[PDB]
Amino acid sequence: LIAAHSHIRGLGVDADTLEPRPSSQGLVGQEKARKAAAVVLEMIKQGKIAGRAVLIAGPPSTGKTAIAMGMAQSLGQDVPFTTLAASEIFSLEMSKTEALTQAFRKSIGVRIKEESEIMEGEVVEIQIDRSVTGGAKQGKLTIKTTDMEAIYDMGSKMIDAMTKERVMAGDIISIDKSSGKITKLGRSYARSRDYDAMGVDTKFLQCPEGELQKRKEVVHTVSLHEIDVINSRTQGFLALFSGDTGEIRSEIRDQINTKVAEWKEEGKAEIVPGVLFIDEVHMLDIECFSYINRALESDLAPIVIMASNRGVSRIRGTDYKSPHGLPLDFLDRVVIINTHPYTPDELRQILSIRAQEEEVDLTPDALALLTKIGQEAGLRYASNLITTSQLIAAKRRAKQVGVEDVQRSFKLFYDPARSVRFVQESEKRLIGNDGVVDF
Amino acid sequence: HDEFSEWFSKDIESHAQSNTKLNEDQLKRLHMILKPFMLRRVKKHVQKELGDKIEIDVFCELSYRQRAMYQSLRNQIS
Numbered sequence: 001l002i003a004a005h006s007h008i009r010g011l012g013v014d015a016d017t018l019e020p021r022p023s024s025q026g027l028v029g030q031e032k033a034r035k036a037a038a039v040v041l042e043m044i045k046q047g048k049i050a051g052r053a054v055l056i057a058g059p060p061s062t063g064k065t066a067i068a069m070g071m072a073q074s075l076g077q078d079v080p081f082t083t084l085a086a087s088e089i090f091s092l093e094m095s096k097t098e099a100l101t102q103a104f105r106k107s108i109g110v111r112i113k114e115e116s117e118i119m120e121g122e123v124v125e126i127q128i129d130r131s132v133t134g135g136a137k138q139g140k141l142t143i144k145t146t147d148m149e150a151i152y153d154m155g156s157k158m159i160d161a162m163t164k165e166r167v168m169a170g171d172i173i174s175i176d177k178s179s180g181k182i183t184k185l186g187r188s189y190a191r192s193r194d195y196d197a198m199g200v201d202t203k204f205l206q207c208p209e210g211e212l213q214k215r216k217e218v219v220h221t222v223s224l225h226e227i228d229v230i231n232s233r234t235q236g237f238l239a240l241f242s243g244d245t246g247e248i249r250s251e252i253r254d255q256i257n258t259k260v261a262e263w264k265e266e267g268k269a270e271i272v273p274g275v276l277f278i279d280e281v282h283m284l285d286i287e288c289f290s291y292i293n294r295a296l297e298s299d300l301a302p303i304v305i306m307a308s309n310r311g312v313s314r315i316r317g318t319d320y321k322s323p324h325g326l327p328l329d330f331l332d333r334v335v336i337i338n339t340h341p342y343t344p345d346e347l348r349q350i351l352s353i354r355a356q357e358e359e360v361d362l363t364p365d366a367l368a369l370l371t372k373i374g375q376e377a378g379l380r381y382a383s384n385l386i387t388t389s390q391l392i393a394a395k396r397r398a399k400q401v402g403v404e405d406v407q408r409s410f411k412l413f414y415d416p417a418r419s420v421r422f423v424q425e426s427e428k429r430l431i432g433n434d435g436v437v438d439f
Numbered sequence: 440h441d442e443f444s445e446w447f448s449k450d451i452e453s454h455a456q457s458n459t460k461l462n463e464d465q466l467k468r469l470h471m472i473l474k475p476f477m478l479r480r481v482k483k484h485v486q487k488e489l490g491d492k493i494e495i496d497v498f499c500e501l502s503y504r505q506r507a508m509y510q511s512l513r514n515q516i517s
C-alpha cells in the first residue's frame with residue numbers, strides 16, 4: 001500500500017560527484033544533509049571504517065526519517081539495516097545492556113557460501129517398507145531422466161518427506177540432497193482412472209534431460225545474532241524468532257568473534273558490515289550511553305546513524321540538561337548533521353510528489369491554498385488534507401479536487417495550531433491537573 | 440675423465456652455458472667421441488606410431504594457514 005515513505009526511491013545523488021540534485025528520487029528540497037548522508041553512505045559501502053556515530057539533528061517534520069529511508073532504499077537487500085526504535089530496548093525479559101548488544105550484533109551480516117546437491121527427473125517407482133506399531137522404515141526410489149536410470153536408497157527422513165509430499169509414480173521432483181526438501185514440479189503422464197483420492201492434475205512437463213546429481217553453490221546471509229543464538233543453546237533453537245533468548249554469556253561471544261575471524265581468513269565467510277538506525281535516541285537514558293560509547297571500539301561494530309528532535313533537554317535517569325538530551329561525553333564521539341526547515345517553493349513540490357503518489361489529481365488554486373496551509377501547519381497536516389480532500393471529492397462525485405474540498409477538510413479536521421487554542425479556550429470542561437465541571 | 444675434471448670446469452660452465460649457449464669446445468669433440476660409444480634411436484621413430492602428449496601447467500596459491508606456516512618456516516630460518 002501507500003505508507004508515509006513509499007514515494008522515496010533512494011537518496012538521489014550523483015555516483016561520480018555525489019552532488020545533491022534539487023529534485024531527484026522523492027527526496028526533494030534539501031541539499032546539505034543529503035550530501036552528507038551520501039558521504040556516510042559511501043563510507044558504509046566501503047566497509048572498511050568501523051565504529052562511527054552520525055546524529056541527524058533538526059526540527060521535527062523536516063525529513064530525517066526520510067533521509068534514513070533514502071539510505072535504506074539505496075543499499076538494497078544485501079547489507080543489513082536495523083530500524084531500531086529507542087524504546088524497544090527497555091525489556092523485562094533481558095537486561096537493558098544486552099538488548100543493545102543484540103541490536104549491534106544484528107547489523108553485522110555474515111555471508112557464507114555452501115554447496116548443495118540437487119536432483120532432477122521423473123520418478124518411476126516408490127518402494128516403502130514399514131513396520132507395524134512403531135519402527136524403522138526402508139526405501140528404494142527408482143528415478144529416470146532421458147539418460148540415466150538410478151535405483152537410490154532412502155532413510156527415515158526421506159520417507160517422512162515422501163509421504164508428506166505424496167510422491168506417486170510419474171512425478172517430476174527435485175530433491176536437494178543436503179537439505180532434504182521435495183518440490184514437485186509436475187507430471188509427465190495423466191491422472192489414473194482407478195483410484196478416487198488421487199488429487200489435482202498438475203502442470204504437464206516433459207522428462208528432464210541432463211544428469212541426476214547436479215551441484216549448486218548457494219549463498220546464505222545470517223546476522224551475528226543468529227549465530228549467537230544457534231551456538232548458545234543445545235536444543236532450544238527457534239528462540240531467535242520467538243524472542244525467548246534470555247541471556248548470552250560473554251564466553252559465547254568471545255568464541256564466536258574468533259571463529260568468524262577464522263572464517264574470514266579461510267575464505268569461507270565474508271563480513272558485510274551494516275547500519276544500525278536508532279530512531280529518536282533521546283529516549284535512552286544514561287545507562288545506555290555508557291555502553292553505546294564503548295561498543296563502538298571494536299572491529300565488529302556497525303556504523304550507527306541516529307535521529308533526534310529535542311533542544312536543551314534533560315537526560316533521562318539523571319538530573320541535568322544537555323543539548324539534544326545526549327551527554328557531553330557521548331557528544332564528542334558523534335558527528336552532528338543539521339537539517340533545516342523548509343521553504344514554500346519546496347513544500348509545493350513535496351506536496352506535488354505526495355499527491356502524485358497517492359493518485360490524487362489537483363487544480364492549481366487548490367494546490368496554492370494547500371501550500372498556504374502547509375506554511376502554517378507543516379507537511380503532516382497537509383498530506384492528511386490531500387487524502388481527505390480526495391475522498392470528499394469522491395463523495396460528491398467530482399473528478400479533480402478543488403478549493404471547496406480543501407476548505408471542507410480544513411473545517412472538519414483541525415491542525416494542532418487550532419487544537420491548542422481549542423484547549424486554551426474551554427479549560428473548564430477538560431481535565432487538567434485539577435478538577436473539572438459539567439456545565 | 441680426470442681430464443674431464445678440466446671439462447668439469449666445462450661442466451660448471453655448462454650451467455653457465457645453460458644460461459649462455461654460445462660455446463663450441465667439446466661438442467664437436469663429442470661428435471668425434473659419440474660416433475662410437477652410443478647409438479641413438481629417436482622418439483620420432485616411435486612416436487609416429489603414437490599420438491601426442493601435452494603438459495598443462497596450472498598454478499596455485501597458499502592459504503592463510505598454509506602461508507602462515509610457510510612464513511613460520513621463514514621465521515624458523517630467521
Ligand SMILES: Nc1ncnc2c1ncn2[C@@H]1O[C@H](COP(=O)(O)OP(=O)(O)O)[C@@H](O)[C@H]1O
Pocket residue numbers: 004005026027028029030059060061062063064065066067350379380
Ligand atoms: N525532503 C523530503 N522529501 C520527500 N519527503 C519528505 C521530505 N521531507 C519530509 N518529507 C515527508 O514528510 C514526512 C515527515 O518526514 P519525517 O522524516 O517523518 O519527519 P520527522 O523527521 O520529523 O519524523 C515524511 O512522511 C516524508 O514523506
